Amino acid sequence: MQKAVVMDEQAIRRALTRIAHEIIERNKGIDGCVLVGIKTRGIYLARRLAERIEQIEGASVPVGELDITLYRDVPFPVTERNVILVDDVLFTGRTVRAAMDAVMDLGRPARIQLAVLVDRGHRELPIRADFVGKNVPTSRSELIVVELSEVDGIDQVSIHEK
Amino acid sequence: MQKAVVMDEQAIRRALTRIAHEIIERNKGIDGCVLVGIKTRGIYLARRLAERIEQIEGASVPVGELDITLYRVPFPVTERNVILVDDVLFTGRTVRAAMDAVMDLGRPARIQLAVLVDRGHRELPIRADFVGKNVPTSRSELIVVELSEVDGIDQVSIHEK
Numbered sequence: 001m002q003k004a005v006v007m008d009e010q011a012i013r014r015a016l017t018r019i020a021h022e023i024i025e026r027n028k029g030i031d032g033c034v035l036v037g038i039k040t041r042g043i044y045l046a047r048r049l050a051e052r053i054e055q056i057e058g059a060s061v062p063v064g065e066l067d068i069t070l071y072r073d074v075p076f077p078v079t080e081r082n083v084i085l086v087d088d089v090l091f092t093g094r095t096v097r098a099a100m101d102a103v104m105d106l107g108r109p110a111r112i113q114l115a116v117l118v119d120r121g122h123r124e125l126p127i128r129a130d131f132v133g134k135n136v137p138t139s140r141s142e143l144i145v146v147e148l149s150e151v152d153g154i155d156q157v158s159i160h161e162k
Numbered sequence: 163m164q165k166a167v168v169m170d171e172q173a174i175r176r177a178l179t180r181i182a183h184e185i186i187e188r189n190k191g192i193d194g195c196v197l198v199g200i201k202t203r204g205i206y207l208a209r210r211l212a213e214r215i216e217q218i219e220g221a222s223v224p225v226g227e228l229d230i231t232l233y234r235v236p237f238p239v240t241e242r243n244v245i246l247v248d249d250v251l252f253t254g255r256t257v258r259a260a261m262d263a264v265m266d267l268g269r270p271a272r273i274q275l276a277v278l279v280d281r282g283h284r285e286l287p288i289r290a291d292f293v294g295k296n297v298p299t300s301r302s303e304l305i306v307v308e309l310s311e312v313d314g315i316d317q318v319s320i321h322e323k
């Protein structure tokens with residue numbers, strides 16, 4: 001039962017924009033930078049980011065896609081390139097680990113970074129994002145729902161409880 | 163040229179005792195926990211912690227050894243709390259291989275990393291759960307961790323070319 005809306009379109013906007021700036025700044029430009037979406041809602045975020053970057057720096061960033069289905073609970077630039085994984089939500093980090101494995105299976109990255117719209121904590125591996133839209137503390141039970149216009153009709157992040 | 167000394171026998175002694183209490187407090191008891199040192203000094207660091215934790219909680223924590231050059235008495239892993247132990251966290255690339263190792267052998271409940279020092283310059287989204295000490299450094303500089311079991315004495319230092 002949707003407890004509360006944590007992020008509205010506006011917030012999602014401001015966060016995404018800030019992150020774009022962060023990314024450019026932490027890499028001193030976007031040359032050698034590749035954005036990679038982890039699953040459906042991560043590809044869209046990654047696409048938006050590239051869009052912003054494209055807007056701020058006047059140069060475009062390559063975008064890759066990763067449908068981490070090889071999670072047993074088209075190629076893109078890699079070698080000596082800065083692979084920036086993008087995902088909407090970060091929980092245990094098991095998905096990011098796979099993403100890493102995949103990325104490196106595909107070449108020698110100069111380094112891989114992580115950007116997520118939200119970090120709900122409860123990590124299970126020594127992993128952390130380099131860019132975070134918003135930390136949303138949560139209970140192990142609770143579920144974070146990220147809705148994105150490209151797929152859900154609207155932009156909104158919310159917490160649901162059983 | 164050794165730029166300095168950033169950690170001596172006393173700093174190290176404290177850092178580990180802290181981390182030992184830290185590990186315990188963070189898992190609400192060492193039950194289910196396991197230590198896994200990375201390379202030689204990583205293994206000794208693991209043993210020191212195991213000893214302290216024991217001195218502290220009384221129980222004992224298994225200590226496994228892991229080499230990373232092939233990755234560049236069965237040991238508990240699956241459903242255990244795997245605490246990787248290494249002396250220096252640099253690019254994080256070594257920890258990545260170590261995870262791959264661990265998760266290839268079994269399915270751990272969770273994996274945690276503990277290091278004596280973290281000199282930054284991460285090249286992967288990896289971070290220690292427990293850190294002896296952060297020592298900012300230049301890409302050029304080199305951190306040297308000396309441990310009595312191998313180097314005759316305990317001391318961490320920064321060297322410059």
Ligand SMILES: Nc1nc2c(ncn2[C@@H]2O[C@H](CO)[C@@H](OP(=O)(O)O)[C@H]2O)c(=O)[nH]1
Pocket residue numbers: 039040041042088089143146
């Ligand atoms: N209903 C439901 N959704 C989950 C559960 N675990 C994760 N999710 C999230 O629900 C979303 C889709 O409605 C997914 O977002 P994603 O695109 O970040 O992976 C997924 O992450 C779960 O147990 N139940």
Ligand SMILES: Nc1nc2c(ncn2[C@@H]2O[C@H](COP(=O)(O)O)[C@@H](O)[C@H]2O)c(=O)[nH]1
Pocket residue numbers: 039088089090091092093094095096120142143144145146
């Ligand atoms: N949006 C969302 N996905 C979640 C959440 N918890 C787990 N997941 C799922 O877990 C994957 C990553 O899980 P993790 O490795 O971070 O625990 C995501 O791609 C998603 O399918 C949550 O709170 N929100």
Ligand SMILES: O=c1ccn([C@@H]2O[C@H](COP(=O)(O)O)[C@@H](O)[C@H]2O)c(=O)[nH]1
Pocket residue numbers: 201248249250251252253254255256257281303304305306
């Ligand atoms: O100044 C340094 C940096 C790294 N290392 C070695 O590199 C490992 C760190 O791996 P990584 O994070 O560079 O991948 C350490 O345990 C250590 O054996 C050193 O000896 N000195």
Ligand SMILES: [Mg+2]
Pocket residue numbers: 038039041042087088089
């Ligand atoms: Mg996601």
Ligand SMILES: [Mg+2]
Pocket residue numbers: 200201203204248249250
């Ligand atoms: Mg080491």
